[PDB]
Design an enzyme around this catalytic site. Structure first.
Site, PDB file in Angstrom:
ATOM      1  CG  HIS A  27      -2.141  -0.822   1.026  1.00 40.37           C
ATOM      2  ND1 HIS A  27      -3.254  -0.392   0.344  1.00 40.37           N
ATOM      3  CD2 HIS A  27      -2.413  -2.079   1.442  1.00 40.37           C
ATOM      4  CE1 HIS A  27      -4.168  -1.345   0.353  1.00 40.37           C
ATOM      5  NE2 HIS A  27      -3.678  -2.384   1.005  1.00 40.37           N
ATOM      6  CE  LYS A  38      -6.124  14.270   0.046  1.00 36.96           C
ATOM      7  NZ  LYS A  38      -6.096  13.126  -0.888  1.00 36.96           N
ATOM      8  NE  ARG A  39      -5.363  10.072   9.969  1.00 39.67           N
ATOM      9  CZ  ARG A  39      -5.048   9.114  10.837  1.00 39.67           C
ATOM     10  NH1 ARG A  39      -5.682   7.944  10.828  1.00 39.67           N
ATOM     11  NH2 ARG A  39      -4.098   9.337  11.733  1.00 39.67           N
ATOM     12  CE  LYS A  71      -2.821  10.734   3.030  1.00 37.97           C
ATOM     13  NZ  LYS A  71      -3.706  10.421   1.850  1.00 37.97           N
ATOM     14  CB  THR A  85      -9.801   5.321  -2.385  1.00 29.68           C
ATOM     15  OG1 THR A  85      -9.449   5.522  -1.016  1.00 29.68           O
ATOM     16  CG2 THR A  85      -9.166   4.043  -2.885  1.00 29.68           C
ATOM     17  CE  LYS A 127     -13.525   7.067  -0.566  1.00 29.82           C
ATOM     18  NZ  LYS A 127     -13.096   7.153   0.858  1.00 29.82           N
TER      19      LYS A 127
END
Ligand SMILES: CC1(C)C=C[C@]2(C(=O)O)CC[C@]3(C)C(=CC[C@@H]4[C@@]5(C)C[C@@H](O)[C@H](O)C(C)(C)[C@@H]5CC[C@]43C)[C@@H]2C1
Ligand SMILES: CC1(C)C=C[C@]2(C(=O)O)CC[C@]3(C)C(=CC[C@@H]4[C@@]5(C)C[C@@H](O)[C@H](O)C(C)(C)[C@@H]5CC[C@]43C)[C@@H]2C1
Lengths: 813, 813
Positions: free
Chosen positions: B354, B545-546, B551, B653, B657
């Protein structure tokens, strides 16, 4: 099948069967190909529970409309046992479900045996609470049972090489179908912190919060459609608890330990902090619930009516903190003046004492209360001070009275005497049998009785005829019903009518036959579940109750060894054959009690394998004694042993269970034995040994055990056998502690009663040889046990302490 | 009401209403006068759950008859969210229950909001598992979800003075109506002990036992009557546990801590012993269950058929111990020779990677494994040794390859590389997007790929259209259904048909109108639940998101400050108004991530209260981001931010969405972004910044952030503001760590993408000014999102890894 179990009426049997299948499928998510008997039990359990809820809702409905005075029974113990059969019986469902389950190819009795005991108690005190709840429901009183939902009840007792092993009673593993979690009514409970004084008064601050979550269990009355509530609190951590992160989450366990486990001491006080927490926990959550309910009632700020709407019964000193907690709320939160609050408190609380044994008395160290409950300590001092002002005023100059009566005990560590607190803060204090109540007045609370004589009462204990007759002994209930009808089940005085059957030949045959069936059934339970082989024609001599020095299992042991030695001396003489059964749990720390258990099995090891004895004498230790084992062994009993030293057993309730079920009693003039013999007549009772007076006489003179060892050769022989290693051949001195205690430091005077006990045992053997006369005495016992119904007891509490009227009237279905 | 929600057909509506009332009364023990909305939720929940069980039973029935190959999905995380609506939808019950509840005077939507999220995951990895289970059920695969039933899920995020506070997610307080406890299938799990060698082989002895109790949750397929099982293990202490007494009972908590709490790290590895225990716990319980099921099957001792009957999918390296555990059972317990067991193991296991981030990789210290799992360590060495013999044989002399490939890492503390274990012991290893899969082959597992190229595959991640469209966005689902029918819900490729509507005027109005309703609805959720006031006509710019450095929430922050500074510079110029929404949780220990959160709110504090800004710019931090908040915010979004540095986000992901729901994407050529742009065409995507190649080029040269600070005056200004205390006026140097990290130790090259990002943001603003052209691009996105359905993903796993055929066929009702 049998009349007392109710109507098995076609349309009800059909409805039951389909609801069984609905639960098997939807609730348990199983089918007939995979379902084990346990799944079958649960399907039944859920099906029966369904019939309760309708009534449960309309009962609580009724109390809301009518707003009667409410009874709150606070206990740290509720020894409920199994709930299924008791529920079926109380609802008139027993034959319906038997039919329903038969038509499904299931044996209901096999299913019943799967249910765990709710073992949320130790012995008498906890089972009394259970009996009380049933009687309170049966008499239509608006009553609630309040306690703790322990995750682990009384430990399961295993015997390993004749020694007791404790293992956790994980009674919730498969779930409890009977309870309803009520998270929406969770309440805060506070600990630690400190006291701040303002102009506004005292403030309890900087406290830790533990949450208290209630679980409700229905309590069905006997055929009256009343369903009361038992509310048990469970400990939960708040969500900002400590809130590195992982550890914060794991430490939530510390708060939740409060409701984890029942303390396993019967009649013994251990001053542990965890125990104090459980005590405050139940008290604080319960009082907020009570106050909350009082404000939200169809009535009228005003706490003057509080004692008219609320009664709080304290089951021993364990919930004694109810008294300062009620003051705290009233004074600190609702802003009432001290004196009015106190009047409200006294008129609300009543106290039931369960023992006079000094080591059973709760005396909490001050420093524990200071850290944990600082505000309550202050309240306690203030209560104490004002009380001593009343004592000084009534008895001026009596300085020794002052210290004797203080709630605060001086000495190396200052203690609070919780019994004293209870007396001062209650309008009623009661003993649990007439003799015990008298002992309270004359000795340990003499000072308090002189001050407030009007406060002291008796309420002789009772048991419930539903569990203790109809349920555990259907055969005996049926034959009684054939003759006198069914009304006796909720009015047990009606058993007197059976006196006019003492000479009836058919009834004699019936009583003796029911006893014989119970004995055959229990002998078969022993085989299948424990591979032990007993002769069912022998006399069933049983002593079941918690292991304790005062209860004198040792006296029994000595008689057992005597019978053995006599047989061995004259092998070919005839002796009435006996099966001696002794059972009960010892507290984990109580070393002596554990030794006694070891002795009993050690005796069994010699006696049960001596070919010369044959099947004339058997000694069996009954493993894991508990409510559901009592339901089996009691109906099977011929001789009941209640042989505590006079003055030590406050009441006893086992004694009453055996009376109701066709055992004759061998006992001392102790506790409720005195009233039992009075009801049946002393001729129908094997009474032996010292009276209370004789004990005191022996105490002044001084008790020298050596004297009995010297004068009784049969006793000397037993003591030599114990010392020489006769019963412990590999460990010759294994029992030195017991011999040593018996000779030099025996608080309970085992030897002083030995002679009179053995001789009385001979008289019992004599009567058993005459089956017809045994049974007629049995009939005289069963017929006079009316007084010992908990319905009577509760009716007395209701009228003489709580001020409410017992009703026998139905509510609509 | 709307077509996709099913038939509200009179007889079904009647049956629903009466079952609602039955549960309210019998199950919840309430009535209409006392029931709170929560009680109403539970009544509905139990009523819907009823419709599942029949299908659940016949589904498991079917698998027993047909005995197909079984898929076991092992994950430490299952981020399920809410279950009620998903259940209604998948069962075609949604309009029926809406009608039923309407006729009872209840708003179903109000009821839905009462359900807790099953927050048993952190982010992408855990939600992927949830999406997978749904897709596996929908494709009729005989599949099981195996994990841990954590008592506390991902923490609830509170913002206090702009700082994150964690509080316990006590998601079980009121109960979980969806699970069925199955205590009867409890299994032993072993820890510690030591290894004993005999003639018979190795023996693992002197172990502590922890019990593993399963809970089953139904997993309904989409309208196909398949109901699969998710089995979650809970930790229980054995009954002879430690068995002074009280403490023994309290220490049971230590064993039960295993399943207490989810570790809250997203893409980060903490080598804690408790974590290793959770990992072995799930692995050991799951493998016995798998083996047990295999033996008791309509087939034929023989483990040769094992890989034909069983597939075990490892979700990252967390369940990697499945590999040595399977060997242990096979070799030590079933007595198979090493080589046969190994062939069975490899053909059974497959591994999904992952992330390539080094700090996310599990490398367990040997000494931990030695104490906790001594036998597994031995097995690991033996696996390693034999593997290196294969490497030495294929690449003779290559000594550096040997150490690079070892499962055992040398150094100050020896470690086991679990990724290496997984590669060696699996027949298939996959990345989660094409680019990420390529990166695995070319860099971090290059050595392994050279050895066994046939082992490496891609399976681009997907999401479920049931939750991620039909459920969270009924309005958009309806307008699609009007045009193209309903079949797209289980065959999302059919959305291509929408391309022929890109010029249709009515459809344009519909798409834009649905977006506008979602935005109005979400703006109203913000008001009522958080008292925050947003202009619904602005562009909804969202990054959820986290919180993580890779990120690059920071890049977003910088753009936000730029927009602010431009407005302030030229106050009267027109700018396209925006609402910037950023949300997500930071791991408790991750200090930097917590600082970023603080910055975002600090920015909001300056920007949201500047009167000159007006309602042209708003910065809102979305508290407590989680699945059920994603279901609300995603439909409301115009701009989706997927701005991770190229090469760091394995797939993503969330990106998918937003694509499915009418947001346009601004992003880097990272993870699944690359495939998304490929499907929609690069013209329909705002792609900016470095490619993977450009990053490497910058790394060799060396990344000097100072260079960008020097050449971009707009950037210099922002850095000065941060340093001078512009956003933290009371704590001038509050953000020194962030500035310092940005300038000197920025692993993620925030500055290198700044220029290209701001310019690209201008292009987005340009397009939003032309509503019609925005929406046509939106239509081009929604219409090409077919590929990103988890049904596609799962069909690929099924055919290319597990060797089973996806079926779309119904089972009888
Ligand atoms: C004071 C409160 C907030 C906290 C404690 C309560 C208690 O008395 O145990 C909690 C339980 C309820 C809600 C309570 C009171 C009445 C209902 C009732 C009997 C009401 C009746 O209309 C309703 O028809 C029924 C359903 C009969 C309820 C049953 C539940 C109780 C007794 C209180 C509520
Ligand atoms: C191997 C065992 C001992 C342990 C794990 C089990 C499993 O596969 O999860 C536990 C569950 C059952 C008992 C199991 C198998 C079949 C049934 C079944 C499908 C059987 C069917 O006849 C029955 O008709 C139904 C009711 C359909 C059952 C459902 C339950 C299972 C799947 C196993 C039993």
């Amino acid at each position: 099948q049998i009349s007392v179990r109710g109507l098995a009426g076609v349309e009800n049997v059909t409805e039951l069967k389909k609801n069984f299948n609905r639960h098997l499928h939807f609730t348990l998510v199983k089918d007939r190909n995979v379902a084990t008997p346990r799944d079958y039990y649960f399907a039944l359990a859920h099906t029966v529970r369904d019939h309760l809820v309708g009534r449960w809702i309309r009962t609580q409905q009724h109390y809301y409309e009518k707003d009667p005075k409410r009874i709150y029974y606070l206990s740290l113990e509720f020894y409920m046992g199994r709930t299924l059969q008791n529920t079926m019986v109380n609802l008139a469902l027993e034959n319906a479900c038997d039919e329903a389950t038969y038509q499904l190819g299931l044996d209901m009795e096999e299913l019943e045996e799967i249910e765990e005991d709710a073992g949320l108690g130790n012995g008498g005190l906890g089972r009394l609470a259970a009996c009380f709840l049933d009687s309170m429901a049966t008499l239509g009183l608006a009553a609630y049972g309040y306690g703790i939902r322990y995750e682990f009840g009384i430990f399961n007792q295993k015997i390993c090489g004749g020694w007791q092993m404790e293992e956790a009673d994980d009674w919730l593993r498969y779930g409890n179908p009977w309870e309803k979690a009520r998270p929406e009514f969770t309440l805060p409970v506070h600990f630690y912190g400190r006291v701040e004084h303002t102009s506004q008064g005292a403030k309890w601050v900087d406290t830790q919060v533990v949450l208290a979550m209630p679980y409700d269990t229905p309590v069905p009355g006997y055929r009256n459609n009343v369903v009361n509530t038992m509310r048990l609190w469970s400990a939960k951590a708040p969500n900002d608890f400590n809130l590195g992160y992982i550890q914060a989450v794991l430490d939530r366990n510390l708060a939740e330990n409060i409701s984890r486990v029942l303390y396993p001491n019967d009649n013994f006080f251990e001053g542990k902090e965890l125990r104090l927490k459980q005590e405050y926990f139940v008290v604080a959550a319960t009082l907020q619930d009570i106050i909350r309910r009082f404000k939200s009632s169809k009535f009228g700020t005003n706490f003057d009516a509080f004692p008219d709407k609320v009664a709080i019964q304290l089951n021993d000193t364990h919930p004694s903190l109810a008294i300062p907690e009620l003051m705290r709320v009233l004074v600190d939160l609702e802003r009432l003046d001290w004196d009015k609050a106190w009047e409200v408190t006294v008129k609300t609380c009543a106290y039931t004492n369960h023992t006079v044994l000094p080591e059973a008395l709760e005396r909490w160290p001050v420093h524990l209360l200071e850290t944990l409950l600082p505000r309550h300590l202050q309240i306690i001092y203030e209560i104490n001070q004002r009380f001593l002002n009343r004592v000084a005023a009534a008895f001026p100059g009596d300085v020794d009275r002052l210290r004797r009566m203080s709630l605060v005990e001086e000495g190396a560590v200052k203690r609070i005497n919780m019994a004293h607190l209870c007396i001062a803060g209650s309008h009623a204090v009661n003993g649990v049998a007439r003799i015990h109540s008298e002992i309270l007045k004359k000795t340990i609370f003499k000072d308090f009785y002189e001050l407030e004589p009007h406060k002291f009462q008796n309420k002789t204990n009772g048991i419930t005829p539903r569990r203790w007759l109809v349920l555990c002994n259907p055969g005996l209930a049926e034959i009684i019903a054939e003759r006198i009808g069914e009304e006796y089940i909720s009015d047990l005085d009606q058993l007197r009518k059976l006196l006019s059957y003492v000479d009836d030949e058919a009834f004699i045959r019936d009583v003796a036959k029911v006893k014989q069936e119970n004995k055959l059934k229990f002998a078969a339970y022993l085989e299948r579940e424990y591979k032990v082989h007993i002769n069912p024609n022998s006399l069933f001599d049983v002593q079941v109750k918690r292991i304790h020095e005062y209860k004198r299992q040792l006296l029994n042991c000595l008689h057992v060894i005597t019978l053995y030695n006599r047989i061995k001396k004259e092998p070919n003489k005839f002796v009435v054959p006996r099966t001696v059964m002794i059972g009960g749990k010892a507290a984990p720390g109580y070393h002596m009690a554990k030794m006694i258990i070891k002795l009993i099995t050690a005796i069994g090891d010699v006696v049960n394998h001596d070919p010369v004895v044959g099947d004339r004498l058997r000694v069996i230790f009954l493993e894991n004694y508990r409510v559901s084992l009592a339901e089996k062994v009691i109906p099977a009993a011929d001789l009941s042993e209640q042989i505590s030293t006079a003055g030590t057993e406050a009441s006893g309730t086992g004694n009453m269970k055996f009376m109701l079920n066709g055992a004759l009693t061998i006992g001392t003039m102790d506790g409720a034995n005195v009233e039992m013999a009075e009801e049946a007549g002393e001729e129908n009772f094997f009474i032996f040994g010292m009276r209370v007076e004789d004990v005191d006489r022996l105490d002044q003179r001084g008790y020298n055990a050596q004297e009995y060892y010297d004068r009784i050769p049969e006793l000397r022989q037993i003591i030599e056998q114990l010392s020489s290693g006769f019963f412990s051949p590999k460990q010759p001195d294994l029992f030195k502690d017991i011999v040593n205690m018996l000779m030099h430091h025996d608080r309970f005077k085992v030897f002083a009663d030995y002679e009179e006990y053995v001789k009385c045992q001979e008289r019992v053997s004599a009567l058993y040889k005459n089956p017809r006369e045994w049974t007629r005495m049995v009939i005289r016992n069963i017929a006079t046990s009316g007084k010992f119904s908990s319905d009577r007891t509760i009716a007395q509490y209701a009228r003489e302490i709580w001020g409410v009227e017992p009703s026998r009237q139905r509510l609509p279905a």
